[PDB]
């Protein structure tokens, strides 16, 4: 069969690295048409939903161990913030065919046997009976579960214990003084006010709740608009209807309330924020049905249970949330210490997320833009409730580890009190017994309660060829999925062991693979051998060791915890960009670039190195977190003019600021076009602030420093360049 072939290369001959490789699809899943019931491109799981580190699975343990390559799965149930965008086929007749023994679901790889009266399970080979329903003008072959690897069903009654719940929201807002002064409360109230119709309400059932919190927990009874304020204070930190109300039936009233809140605490002098007590109030408030507790704060918890200092209450809280189906999202925005390391656990183990906004301050008009945009997209994002996800492997395959934000203790089941849309997950697969078939399989199942009062089951079935050729295993290795694997292992090693240990782990992943490819595979002088499909692996890991998450040196605790929290939950596509940035050379930008094709055409990305930064050029750096517009110090007045209006480069805007609208400048338009395009994604909430930097007072040095550190291919501080990294590796895998 056409098993992917090995394409040997010399890493030393590919410097600078051919980074366009980062946008290439993984190695093909070689599956002959006969193994699929209805052959098509939809017959095998798409890389967008699931990516195995190995698309040519080792036929046995000893081979897996020898390859030194990891076996994991980058799983991503949803692709967009809104379920109306590109949904998979949806089954509705209620017929769910499953194997009696392993419980796997009917899929494109089962084999129909005995005149097609029965079916042999591809996961455990058990013989199962074909329900007479299957053939009730269409045949069984017209069914989505037989036609598609990725599809969905309307779950029957026995997959539910209680009627699907309504989308419930409880906003826990910090109204203490730090929040008033920074403008966080205002910005938050405003954004909600501006987005009440962005919040999903597909079944018109969505319920909301508002908790203002300082030293006491402030409640609000909201009447039905149809019967036309009540603020109930509770300072007793030791201690439902009309508190959690219909977003529709109380639309005007909820609006009326949000509008007064800013006035109510307009002159609050209290600096206490009882997160602990408040978190408990919200729990009791929505625990009878479960839902989302979205915390907005710019004040370190300092009163009541759970207070922190410059805690395990939270971890136990998450344990409790898993019982009542509650998820906690956090938006931490302040110039002061927030202990992201500790609070991020709330979201992490409840399937939610924590968003950290360093130095947030209403005084900077641009701080507001970032927070509101992201907070708005976050509340407008669709999600599931009471969801559980598990992966079933074919005989010989076992799911041993699970990474990502969710709740998992001692089972193969991952619980999501709510399943967001913007995160990714990873499962480690161990091969115990030897695989006997020429193929093995993995099937992800997600039992969920959609935010439209419906119970569904989303299935993702992936088929991989087995092989006993070490060459073939490497030839089909997914460099990016593998990069992701080690990224998660690194975060764990970091968020649990040592930061240095994580660095050590990262580097070893490269050393072992390089040493293995060298000894296990067989004219020249001194190349650093590897195959084309793994050609970006050395770069990514090396680049990862320079990321704010693993950097040697000094990084503020919150900025580090945050970076670590992000790398662990980012969708593959953005994880890679967060590790290795897209850099654009604008001054010599092709004419198509900056203009439509309403999607803007982007210039081709250049290597992330200051080597290519001409002192007279214009460059745009995108690292998934921010955007840096770098203009050379010796840029021609024409260029300086075409972009900002003046000709004095020293008269250019500096720092976190937007690019001015320069009339009659078509170039100025194309620049603003590229920046706006880089800002729209229908899959993440991220709004990247723009930083303008001038090259060749102390603020200007700081910006150059920051922008410059994004170019991960360069020697940065105490880390060698990529060029040297490779040389270091070559010296190590030598005798």
């Amino acid at each position: 069969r056409p098993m992917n072939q090995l394409y040997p290369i010399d890493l030393l001959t590919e410097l600078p690295p051919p980074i366009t490789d980062l946008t290439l699809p993984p190695p093909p899943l070689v599956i002959p048409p006969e193994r699929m019931l209805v052959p098509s491109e939809l017959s095998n799981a798409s890389p967008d939903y699931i990516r195995s580190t190995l698309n040519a699975v080792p036929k046995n343990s000893s081979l897996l161990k020898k390859s030194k390559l990891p076996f994991g799965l980058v799983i991503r149930p949803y692709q967009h913030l809104y379920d109306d965008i590109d949904p998979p086929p949806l089954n509705e007749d209620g017929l769910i065919v499953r194997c009696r023994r392993c419980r796997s679901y009917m899929n494109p790889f089962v084999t129909f046997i005995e005149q097609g009266r029965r079916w042999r399970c591809n996961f455990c080979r058990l013989a199962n009976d074909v329900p007479m329903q299957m053939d009730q003008p269409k045949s069984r072959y017209d069914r989505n579960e037989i036609k598609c690897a990725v599809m969905e069903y309307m779950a029957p009654k026995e997959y539910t214990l209680r009627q699907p719940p309504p989308a419930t929201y409880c906003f826990l807002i910090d109204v203490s003084q730090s929040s008033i002064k920074s403008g966080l409360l205002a910005t938050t109230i405003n954004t909600l006010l501006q987005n009440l119709d962005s919040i999903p309400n597909h079944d018109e059932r969505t319920r909301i709740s508002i908790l203002c919190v300082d030293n006491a927990i402030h409640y609000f009874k909201i009447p039905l608009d149809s019967e036309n304020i009540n603020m109930m204070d509770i300072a007793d930190l030791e201690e439902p209807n009309s508190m959690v109300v219909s977003l529709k039936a109380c639309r005007q009233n909820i609006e009326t309330l949000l509008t007064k809140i800013p006035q109510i605490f307009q002159s609050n002098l209290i600096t206490n924020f009882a997160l602990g007590p408040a978190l408990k109030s919200a729990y009791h408030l929505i625990g009878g049905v479960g839902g989302k507790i979205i915390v907005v704060s710019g004040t370190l918890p300092n009163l009541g249970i759970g207070k922190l200092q410059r805690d395990s209450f939270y971890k136990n809280f998450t344990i409790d949330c898993s019982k009542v189906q509650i998820t906690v999202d956090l938006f931490l925005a302040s110039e002061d210490y927030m202990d992201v390391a500790s609070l991020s656990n709330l979201s992490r183990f409840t399937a939610g997320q924590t968003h950290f906004y360093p130095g947030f301050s209403g005084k900077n008009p641009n701080d507001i833009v970032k927070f509101s945009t992201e907070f708005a997209k976050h509340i407008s994002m669709d999600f599931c409730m009471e969801t559980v996800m598990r992966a079933r492997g074919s005989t010989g395959l076992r799911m041993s580890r699970f990474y990502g934000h969710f709740f998992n203790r001692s089972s193969d089941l991952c619980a999501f009190s709510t399943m967001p849309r913007d995160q990714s997950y990873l499962f480690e697969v161990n091969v115990d017994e030897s695989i006997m078939a020429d193929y093995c399989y993995v099937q992800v199942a997600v039992l969920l309660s959609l935010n439209n009062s419906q119970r569904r089951i989303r299935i993702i079935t992936l088929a991989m060829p087995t092989t006993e050729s070490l060459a073939e295993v490497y030839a089909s290795a997914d460099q990016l999925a593998i990069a992701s694997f080690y990224n998660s292992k690194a975060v764990e090693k970091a968020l649990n062991s040592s930061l240095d240990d994580a660095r050590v782990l990262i580097n070893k992943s490269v050393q072992d693979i390089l040493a293995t490819y060298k000894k296990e595979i067989v004219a020249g002088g001194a190349p650093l051998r590897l195959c084309a499909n793994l050609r970006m692996f050395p770069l990514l890991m090396h680049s990862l060791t320079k990321h704010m998450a693993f950097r040697s040196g000094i990084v503020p605790s919150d900025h580090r915890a945050s970076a670590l929290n992000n790398l662990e939950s980012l969708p593959l596509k953005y994880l890679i960009k967060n590790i290795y940035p897209d850099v654009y050379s604008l001054h010599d930008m092709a004419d198509e670039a900056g203009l439509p094709v309403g999607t803007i055409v982007l210039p081709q990305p250049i290597n992330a190195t200051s080597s290519l930064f001409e002192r007279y050029g214009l460059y745009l750096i995108d690292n998934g977190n921010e955007l840096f517009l770098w203009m050379g110090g010796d840029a021609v007045p024409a260029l300086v003019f075409d972009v900002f209006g003046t000709q004095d480069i020293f008269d250019i805007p500096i720092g976190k600021q937007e690019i001015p609208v320069v009339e009659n400048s078509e170039f100025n338009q194309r620049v603003r076009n590229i920046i706006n395009q880089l800002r729209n994604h229908d899959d993440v909430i991220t709004y990247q602030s723009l930083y303008i930097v001038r090259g060749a007072a102390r603020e200007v040095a700081t910006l150059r420093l920051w922008a410059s550190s994004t170019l991960v291919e360069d020697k940065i501080l105490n880390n060698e360049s990529y060029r040297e990294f490779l040389q270091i590796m070559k010296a190590r895998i030598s005798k």
Partner: peptide, 9 residues
Amino acid sequence: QLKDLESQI
């Protein structure tokens, strides 16, 4: 505890 709605066992 080792028993869930998705397994259907």
